[PDB]
């Protein structure tokens, strides 16, 4: 069964709000910036942005499979339809979502404000 | 004594779907939707208190929370005690209250007598 056009665009929003808040709570101390969800007829692609991507995937892509197995099981839509990437933010000293988590990590490690 | 033009003795053997045509609309609808699982077990308790009561003696007081129990005409004479939030208050069922709820006989509040007004 399909759904209304008014509901489909609002339920589309609450997906990317919970996804983004979950990934904030997860990778806030890994320099996470945002997500970018592109939907193909084959799959739904989720592009994670981060400062250092190569310390996010784990080793040879170990942490990326736990994340794409959680986000399949939470939002229910089946296997082989979701897949996570990890691209890098271009100018790290511009986006304020990387500069508040760097500043929190600087403060937590005992540095004067 | 009667009720809508029929004495209590025919009400004691008035059937379930025919007594419903004498009641008012809340009570008729309530008997249409059914008496639930914890309301059949109250009438059984009042039968068990009635046929073990002595023939010159009214039965002992029985404690309930069921303030929504309709006073059926097969429930006359019993000593039920319906709660008021604090205490179980003693109720004796008379035949003239056979369309009311049980929970309008334990008052739920202290009827107010005022004092001197303070700083208004």
């Amino acid at each position: 069964v399909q759904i209304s056009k008014k509901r489909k665009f609002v339920a589309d929003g609450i997906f990317k709000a919970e996804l983004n808040e979950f990934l904030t709570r997860e990778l806030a101390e890994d320099g996470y910036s945002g997500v970018e969800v592109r939907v193909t007829p084959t799959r739904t692609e989720i592009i994670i942005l981060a400062t250092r991507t190569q310390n996010v995937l784990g080793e040879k892509g170990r942490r990326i499979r736990e994340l794409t197995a959680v986000v399949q099981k939470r939002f229910g839509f089946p296997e082989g339809s979701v897949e996570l990437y990890a691209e890098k933010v271009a100018t790290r000293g511009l986006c304020a979502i990387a500069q508040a988590e760097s500043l929190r990590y600087k403060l937590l490690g005992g540095l004067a404000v | 004594f009667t009720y809508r033009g029929v004495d209590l003795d025919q009400l004691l053997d008035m059937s379930y779907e025919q007594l419903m045509q004498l009641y008012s609309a809340r009570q008729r609808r309530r008997l249409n939707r059914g008496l639930r699982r914890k309301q059949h077990s109250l009438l059984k308790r009042l039968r068990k208190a009635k046929k073990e009561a002595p023939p010159m003696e009214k039965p002992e007081v029985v404690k309930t929370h069921l303030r929504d129990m309709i006073i059926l005409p097969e429930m006359v004479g019993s000593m039920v005690g319906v709660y008021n939030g604090k205490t179980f208050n003693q109720v004796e069922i008379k035949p003239e209250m056979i369309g009311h709820y049980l929970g309008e006989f334990s008052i739920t509040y202290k009827p107010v007598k005022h004092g001197r007004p303070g700083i208004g």
């Binding site: 919970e18 808040e21 736990e66 959680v70 | -």
Partner: protein, 95 residues
């Protein structure tokens, strides 16, 4: 919780290494583990037992619980259910 609950919760932990929940004590049964009749309270308290030992890693969200598996938690499932290391979970499947 009985054996066919506490065992069956641990079975799908080794399969893919992650488990989600709802923080819903009052749920009749967990939706991933149908045909077993394990409530959500059972899997919730099982992972609450596993987190204090250090076998899983907790993360919360809006409403749902999330749990990953640490390296010393793989061996705790490897001997509790007696598996050989010749099989692998989903760690070393793609790339």
């Amino acid at each position: 919780m009985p054996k066919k609950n506490r065992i069956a919760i641990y079975e799908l932990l080794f399969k893919e290494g992650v488990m989600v929940a709802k923080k819903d004590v009052h749920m009749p049964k967990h939706p991933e583990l149908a045909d077993k009749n394990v409530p959500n309270l059972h899997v919730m308290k099982a992972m609450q037992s596993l987190k204090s030992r250090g076998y899983v890693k907790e993360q919360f969200a809006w409403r749902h619980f999330y749990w990953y598996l640490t390296n010393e938690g793989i061996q705790y499932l490897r001997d509790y259910l007696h598996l050989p290391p010749e099989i692998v979970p989903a760690t070393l499947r793609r790339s």
